[PDB]
Write a protein that binds this ligand. Structure first.
Ligand SMILES: Nc1ccn([C@H]2C[C@H](O)[C@@H](COP(=O)(O)OP(=O)(O)OP(=O)(O)O)O2)c(=O)n1
Ligand SMILES: Nc1ccn([C@H]2C[C@H](O)[C@@H](COP(=O)(O)OP(=O)(O)OP(=O)(O)O)O2)c(=O)n1
Ligand SMILES: [Mg+2]
Ligand SMILES: [Mg+2]
Ligand SMILES: [Mg+2]
Ligand SMILES: [Mg+2]
Lengths: 372, 372
DNA sequence: AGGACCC
DNA sequence: TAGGGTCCT
DNA sequence: AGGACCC
DNA sequence: TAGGGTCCT
């Protein structure tokens, strides 16, 4: 039944990687730019009002002294992101990734094995490592407190190792499920860790200011919950299970309502190798509709290099697009087809499929999937 | 590279099972009825003009002395169909099912292991078991002939065992890929077997009278191939790879054209346990739209009994429908939702999901999928 | 194919 | 206003 | 969700 | 004109 889960969430991930590559960017406010977006910035920059995902413009008139490096090519972020995951897999094999810089790890077996190693005595010497959310008092006779503390120690070891082995700093959150571990990992933001004891669960959940902040409720469900009067986490908690049930479906409803309480049973799943490999190119206005094929070969050349290296081969290929007038707020199109078996065991053939796949049809991408 | 594949295809499967249950139906022309459809009939009935999938009416004015048993409930056909597959898995583990009464088995490893058991002498005594398609002469110095013959013998053993162990008769086809093995299994129809030597491949493929007859080309691609002038297997063979490529997609095109030649690389896949469990009920006009919920509980009661017995549990549930005016030639609708985790470890809850799933929405069905 | 959600 | 990624319907 | 194909 | 089933987009 009761779990100890850690969420590890690195500091300003892309910026960190670029500050390690070029030390002269440390102590300078640094943004990482992709097109006209400053996708992230180091903490010197955020002191100056730069926020995650500003446009460049907004960001250099909040802070004109900002250095920008291009981060369009994710290769090095991707590589560091797998080094991180593989280090954490060493502590416990079941690591779930979320984007390039978050991992969840179910520490439940590891905590219990450390607890049985202690003799009935040093158990009163168990302390916490890091902060305790809401400054809550620990009760060393509460078996759950104890386990969560041991879980804070495992966390501190994982962060130390990330630092010593890969040069990376990060936050960690320790709690009894993934939702709470992830909410509590951000309470002390820069390169620290927090542990949630069960008595403070409602305080954390109610510290949120809109239901969008609950992992699991996105841009669309939020706009829905509103249209009904449901604005705070408490409105969602107290709202009618029925009317909700019959509006968002039985699945989305009964789940998001659980979450509004801090309750989340989802297991930490082994992410292992990726299920897809894609790259992309943005260029607003530039795809005449054929001129831009030389674009399709570029995407291919990288992708083949990557897909290769893994071992596994993809058995499906896909092509994706969008097109331009006023804000069509969601609108990409794709054509999918198997990859013929003779080609699986090079470029030149891969480029055709992708053109014809372009004919059954701002910006362009290729995706390899269905790996084996 | 070169394979020996067998396709096993049982005689009038449902009728066989009902003639074994009630011996008094043997030697009588027997049809198995589902609603107004005689889905299949034993060979005494087909002498009298009864064909597979006639309406009852048509079928009893071609042969008014026809006995009919109801076959709406597939339980016993399903059970016999897994006994068959599991027997064939005993000869070689990789057995692919197709519907309830066809299996493919890749005999390639088994043939080669029997060949290395023979000393360089009794290899000239290898004979065939069953017919040889097109009455083709065997060449005992042709390693491919030899292997195919040994493959005919394995086939005869599998059919004998099916008979001795389960009481069932069937045809088998032996050839170098699945397409050809399946085409050649029907040449000698009632309870016999045929083997295809490579020199006669084109004769078999050209013996077909319309491209619909090629496994792989269905009701829709056929209507397409027509709209273009492609009517015979030879028209498909000689038609332009390009114009085809750019009309049915690169995938459907390059594959169906291979097939038109007798070429088919698809591997025999291990079907193992099912990926879904459903039942259905037809009743044309009867679903007022709620009255008919008592229908939804009936489907559930069986399904739960089955899903159970396997071991594995389903994590998804689905509900399916159609509705009625003139011939909407395809038109079923479904609502899917996860099954909550507390319910996975009974009826009563399963009935609700399925109603609400009915509200987001002739005939009705429930499907359990996503087993684990 | 496309939707919805995440970083 | 990027460039990726996951699983569900 | 629905399409297409198979028995 | 049944009652099932598989995998792809
Ligand atoms: N919409 C998004 C979200 C994030 N990222 C990228 C840039 C980030 O460096 C990285 C990790 O996302 P985080 O929300 O973790 O942001 P940071 O690690 O950069 O900031 P923090 O220190 O607040 O955790 O993924 C992105 O490209 N697009
Ligand atoms: N459209 C279909 C096709 C078949 N079946 C069922 C009834 C059959 O008994 C069984 C196997 O299908 P076959 O084409 O193999 O038909 P038979 O085994 O009945 O006839 P045969 O002796 O020609 O192989 O599946 C069905 O219900 N609906
Ligand atoms: Mg993060
Ligand atoms: Mg981060
Ligand atoms: Mg058959
Ligand atoms: Mg049959």
């Amino acid at each position: 039944s009761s779990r100890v889960i850690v969420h590890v969430d690195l500091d300003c991930f892309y910026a960190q990687v670029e500050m390690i590559s070029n030390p002269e960017l440390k102590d300078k406010p640094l943004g990482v730019q992709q097109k006209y977006l400053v996708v992230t910035c180091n903490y010197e920059a955020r002191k100056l009002g730069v926020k995650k995902l500003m446009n460049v413009r907004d960001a250099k008139e909040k802070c004109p002294q900002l250095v920008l490096v291009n981060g369009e090519d994710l290769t090095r972020y991707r590589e560091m992101s797998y080094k991180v995951t593989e280090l954490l897999e060493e502590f416990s094999p079941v690591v779930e990734r979320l984007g390039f810089d978050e991992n969840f790890v179910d520490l439940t077996e590891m905590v219990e094995k450390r607890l049985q190693q202690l003799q009935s005595d040093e158990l009163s010497a168990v302390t916490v490592s890091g902060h305790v959310y809401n400054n809550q008092s620990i009760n060393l006779l509460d078996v759950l407190h104890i386990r969560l503390l041991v879980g804070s120690q495992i966390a501190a070891e994982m962060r130390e190792a990330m630092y010593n082995q890969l040069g990376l700093t990060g936050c960690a959150g320790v709690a009894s499920n993934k939702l709470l571990a992830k909410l509590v990992s951000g309470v002390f933001k820069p390169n620290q860790q927090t542990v949630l004891l069960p008595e403070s669960c409602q305080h954390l959940i109610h510290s949120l200011n809109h239901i969008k902040e609950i992992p699991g409720i996105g841009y669309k469900t939020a706009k829905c919950l509103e249209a009904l009067g449901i604005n705070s986490v408490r409105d969602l908690q107290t709202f009618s299970p029925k009317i909700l049930e019959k509006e968002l479906g039985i699945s989305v409803a009964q789940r998001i309502q659980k979450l509004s309480f801090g309750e989340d049973n989802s297991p930490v799943i082994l992410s292992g190798p990726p299920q897809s490999f894609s790259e992309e190119d943005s260029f607003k206005k530039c795809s005449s509709e054929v001129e831009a094929k030389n674009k399709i070969e570029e995407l291919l050349a990288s992708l083949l290099n990557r897909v290769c290296q893994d071992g596994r081969k993809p058995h499906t290929v896909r092509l994706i697009i969008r097109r331009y007038s006023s804000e069509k707020h969601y609108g990409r199109e794709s054509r999918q087809c198997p990859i013929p078996s003779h080609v699986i065991q090079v470029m030149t053939p891969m480029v055709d499929i992708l053109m014809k796949l372009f004919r059954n049809m701002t910006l362009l991408s290729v995706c390899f999937c269905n790996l084996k």
